[PDB]
Amino acid sequence: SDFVVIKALEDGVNVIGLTRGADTRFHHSEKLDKGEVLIAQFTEHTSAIKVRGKAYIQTRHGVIESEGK
Amino acid sequence: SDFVVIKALEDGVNVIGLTRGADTRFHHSEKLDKGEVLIAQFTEHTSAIKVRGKAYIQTRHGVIESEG
Amino acid sequence: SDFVVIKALEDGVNVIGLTRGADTRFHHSEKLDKGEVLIAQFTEHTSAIKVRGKAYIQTRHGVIESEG
Amino acid sequence: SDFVVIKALEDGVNVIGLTRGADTRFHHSEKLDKGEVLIAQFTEHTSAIKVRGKAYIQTRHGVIESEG
Amino acid sequence: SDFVVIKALEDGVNVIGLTRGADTRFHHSEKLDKGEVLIAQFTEHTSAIKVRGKAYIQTRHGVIESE
Amino acid sequence: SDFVVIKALEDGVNVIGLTRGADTRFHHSEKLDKGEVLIAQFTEHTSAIKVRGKAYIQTRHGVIESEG
Amino acid sequence: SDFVVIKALEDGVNVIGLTRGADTRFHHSEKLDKGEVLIAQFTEHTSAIKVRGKAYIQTRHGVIESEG
Amino acid sequence: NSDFVVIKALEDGVNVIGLTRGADTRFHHSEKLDKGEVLIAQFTEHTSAIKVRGKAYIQTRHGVIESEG
Amino acid sequence: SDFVVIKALEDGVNVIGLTRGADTRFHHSEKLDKGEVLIAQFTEHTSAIKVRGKAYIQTRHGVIESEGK
Amino acid sequence: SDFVVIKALEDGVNVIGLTRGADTRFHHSEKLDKGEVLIAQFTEHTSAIKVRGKAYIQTRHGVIESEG
Amino acid sequence: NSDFVVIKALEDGVNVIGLTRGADTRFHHSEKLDKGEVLIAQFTEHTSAIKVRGKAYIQTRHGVIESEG
Numbered sequence A, I: 001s002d003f004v005v006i007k008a009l010e011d012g013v014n015v016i017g018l019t020r021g022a023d024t025r026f027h028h029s030e031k032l033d034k035g036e037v038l039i040a041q042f043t044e045h046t047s048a049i050k051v052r053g054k055a056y057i058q059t060r061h062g063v064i065e066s067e068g069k
Numbered sequence B, C, D, F, G, J: 001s002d003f004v005v006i007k008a009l010e011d012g013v014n015v016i017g018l019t020r021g022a023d024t025r026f027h028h029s030e031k032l033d034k035g036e037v038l039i040a041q042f043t044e045h046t047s048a049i050k051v052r053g054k055a056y057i058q059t060r061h062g063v064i065e066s067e068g
Numbered sequence E: 001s002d003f004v005v006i007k008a009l010e011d012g013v014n015v016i017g018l019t020r021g022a023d024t025r026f027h028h029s030e031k032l033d034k035g036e037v038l039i040a041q042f043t044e045h046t047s048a049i050k051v052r053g054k055a056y057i058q059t060r061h062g063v064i065e066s067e
Numbered sequence H, K: 001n002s003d004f005v006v007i008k009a010l011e012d013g014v015n016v017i018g019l020t021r022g023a024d025t026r027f028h029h030s031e032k033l034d035k036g037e038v039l040i041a042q043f044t045e046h047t048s049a050i051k052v053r054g055k056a057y058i059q060t061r062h063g064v065i066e067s068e069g
């Protein structure tokens, strides 16, 4: 199963897993501070992942960068 | 199972799931504000995804950009 | 399964799913306005997809363009 | 399962499904007008496809063009 | 399952399917006129394909031409 | 299953299927006239294939030619 | 099944395994001294791994570096 | 779905020999090729090693090799 | 299943297997002296591997070096 | 399932199959004379293969030469 | 269908040591190689780690490495 790499570029970044199934809502928000890396899979319980905050992201499709409000 | 990366390029972008099955209708619309990134799989419930508003999109077939 | 990306280059583009099975007919027509993007799988219900209107399309086989 | 992309380069192009099985006959013919694209899988019911009329075709093996 | 692309370069091209199984015979011959393309899989009933007539052929192993 | 492409460069080329199993013998010979192409799989019944006569052969491991 | 390589660039790097399942919390923390390497899989019990502290990280998607 | 070897005889009397799969190893078949004939032969439920004797041009997934008589 | 290659660059390198499952602990420490090579899989019993000591390491993601103590 | 190509570069090259299983010993030695080629799989009975004598060897990891 | 390693002895008395798969880890076999011999050895039901002692040229799917005596 695929995974995404997320490196926080400032404090307070949130990687949010959205529930798998007919229902779509946030089940968990993992908070990352500046410099930390989260490597997160898609799973039975998480079928979409949202990133809020400034972060450097790698997936199988390449690099992308989230920008904070 | 594949996924698509969506980065919002302005406020109020909508990433819309369409139901898998005999029936095709919306089911969920995830609102992304500017700079937010959503990475979303195809799933038992979602077999098509629409993007509305200005966003940078990556799939296994390359980059594409939606326009609001 | 494989999926196709379709970006509407003008208003009222139709992405039409043809039923899987012994019978072949349209079960669903998804209208895209200019600039919208539809990322759509082949599925248990859909074994062929037809695009009507000006659009930019990506498949595993590369780029192709439908014209109005 | 594999698919073929067909872009009609003139009106009245026919994309014809041939039946899977001991029997071989045409079970469906999809008519494409100029600039329409059809992306069509091999399936339980369709194990060979025939294109008649001027079209641009992509498959896993590359590009080929049918002529009217 | 893999497929072959055949483009007829002249009228009257035959794409012939050969039976899978202990015995080998032709069970279908599809006629292609000039410019028509057939894309044909190997299947439960067809384990070999013969092309007669002038055509441009593509497979996973690249291009070949019948005459 | 893998397949082999054989193009006959002279009349009378033989493409010979050898039986799968503890016994090895020829079960079929398909005769090809100059310029005919045969695309033939390995199968439940055919675990080796022999070619006699002048032909251009393609397999997954590249081109080889047989000579009469 | 995928794995990540973590090389500690200073003492006390913390590799944190998050529980697979409807609930998310950490179930194990493996500390690495400077120059030590951990090569760790995604598993039935771990579906996300967080790195705290200065580390050089390799995954299938390339190199990334955590900073303390 | 198994791998296969291509053997082109470069002289008469080339032998492609199949060795039995299983606890017993022996030759179970020897296919004679004359000059310029080609044999494309799979590994099988009965054949888990293949010996070539005589001068032949051989292709496997590992590339070209040549046997010498 | 994946494996890692470890070549000891000094005496006394440890290649340590961590238990698969809900419990995580070391279950084995393989000592390598200089110049010895260990090629070790992930397994039903080992889902993470730690190297301590100076070693040259190859994985499917490429070369990494552990630095000694 | 993998295979090794062995080309004898002198007479009496010995290709030795080691038993799969909890015990390890040789169960077959196949001698090759100069210029003969053996293409041998790993199998239910052979999980390690030893070559003695001068031989040119291909495996999926490249070429290697034994020295006799 | 497992991975395999290629070991070529560069001196006499090289040892290719198979380690037991499973909860317990011990040497179950040491195959001794003399100079110039090549062993091609799979990972298996019984062997989940392989140790090489002595001077040898090694190939695996991650590249070449050399053990030293």
Ligand SMILES: N[C@@H](Cc1c[nH]c2ccccc12)C(=O)O
Pocket: A015, A016, A017, A018, A028, A029, A030, A040, A041, A042, A043, A044, A045, A046, A049, G018, G019, G020, G021, G022, G023, G024, G025, G047, G048
């Ligand atoms: N318990 C969660 C852990 C997780 C994996 N990937 C995530 C992405 C975002 C948030 C949480 C997660 C799960 O198995 O799904």
Ligand SMILES: N[C@@H](Cc1c[nH]c2ccccc12)C(=O)O
Pocket: A018, A019, A020, A021, A022, A023, A024, A025, A047, A048, B015, B016, B017, B018, B028, B029, B030, B040, B041, B042, B043, B044, B045, B046, B049
């Ligand atoms: N619960 C939804 C989550 C989701 C995944 N991909 C999406 C794309 C668009 C909207 C929602 C989704 C599902 O599993 O299908």
Ligand SMILES: N[C@@H](Cc1c[nH]c2ccccc12)C(=O)O
Pocket: B018, B019, B020, B021, B022, B023, B024, B025, B047, B048, C015, C016, C017, C018, C028, C029, C030, C040, C041, C042, C043, C044, C045, C046, C049
């Ligand atoms: N409910 C439809 C959704 C769909 C997927 N791909 C499409 C292409 C065209 C039209 C509809 C669709 C299905 O599961 O098949």
Ligand SMILES: N[C@@H](Cc1c[nH]c2ccccc12)C(=O)O
Pocket: C018, C019, C020, C021, C022, C023, C024, C025, C047, C048, D015, D016, D017, D018, D028, D029, D030, D040, D041, D042, D043, D044, D045, D046, D049
């Ligand atoms: N109902 C048809 C739809 C179809 C798929 N590919 C085609 C090619 C040609 C004609 C029809 C089709 C089927 O599932 O087979």
Ligand SMILES: N[C@@H](Cc1c[nH]c2ccccc12)C(=O)O
Pocket: D018, D019, D020, D021, D022, D023, D024, D025, D047, D048, E015, E016, E017, E018, E028, E029, E030, E040, E041, E042, E043, E044, E045, E046, E049
């Ligand atoms: N009914 C035939 C159709 C077919 C597929 N490929 C072919 C090649 C030649 C002739 C017929 C065919 C089958 O499923 O086998």
Ligand SMILES: N[C@@H](Cc1c[nH]c2ccccc12)C(=O)O
Pocket: E018, E019, E020, E021, E022, E023, E024, E025, E047, E048, F015, F016, F017, F018, F028, F029, F030, F040, F041, F042, F043, F044, F045, F046, F049
């Ligand atoms: N009926 C034969 C047809 C065949 C397939 N490949 C061949 C190669 C050579 C000769 C015959 C064949 C079979 O299924 O095996």
Ligand SMILES: N[C@@H](Cc1c[nH]c2ccccc12)C(=O)O
Pocket: F018, F019, F020, F021, F022, F023, F024, F025, F047, F048, H016, H017, H018, H019, H029, H030, H031, H041, H042, H043, H044, H045, H046, H047, H050
């Ligand atoms: N009847 C033999 C035919 C064969 C396949 N590959 C071979 C290689 C050599 C000799 C014979 C063969 C088998 O199925 O195994």
Ligand SMILES: N[C@@H](Cc1c[nH]c2ccccc12)C(=O)O
Pocket: I015, I016, I017, I018, I028, I029, I030, I040, I041, I042, I043, I044, I045, I046, I049, K019, K020, K021, K022, K023, K024, K025, K026, K048, K049
């Ligand atoms: N008996 C251990 C052997 C082993 C494999 N890889 C390892 C890595 C480190 C330590 C021990 C091992 C197991 O099967 O898991």
Ligand SMILES: N[C@@H](Cc1c[nH]c2ccccc12)C(=O)O
Pocket: G015, G016, G017, G018, G028, G029, G030, G040, G041, G042, G043, G044, G045, G046, G049, I018, I019, I020, I021, I022, I023, I024, I025, I047, I048
């Ligand atoms: N017992 C843990 C070991 C582990 C694997 N990968 C990890 C990553 C982080 C922390 C622990 C681990 C497991 O099998 O899941």
Ligand SMILES: N[C@@H](Cc1c[nH]c2ccccc12)C(=O)O
Pocket: H019, H020, H021, H022, H023, H024, H025, H026, H048, H049, J015, J016, J017, J018, J028, J029, J030, J040, J041, J042, J043, J044, J045, J046, J049
């Ligand atoms: N009967 C043996 C034949 C064999 C295959 N590969 C070998 C390598 C060496 C010696 C014998 C063999 C087997 O099936 O295992």
Ligand SMILES: N[C@@H](Cc1c[nH]c2ccccc12)C(=O)O
Pocket: J018, J019, J020, J021, J022, J023, J024, J025, J047, J048, K016, K017, K018, K019, K029, K030, K031, K041, K042, K043, K044, K045, K046, K047, K050
């Ligand atoms: N009987 C051993 C043979 C073996 C394979 N690879 C090895 C590596 C080292 C020592 C012995 C072996 C086994 O099946 O596991």
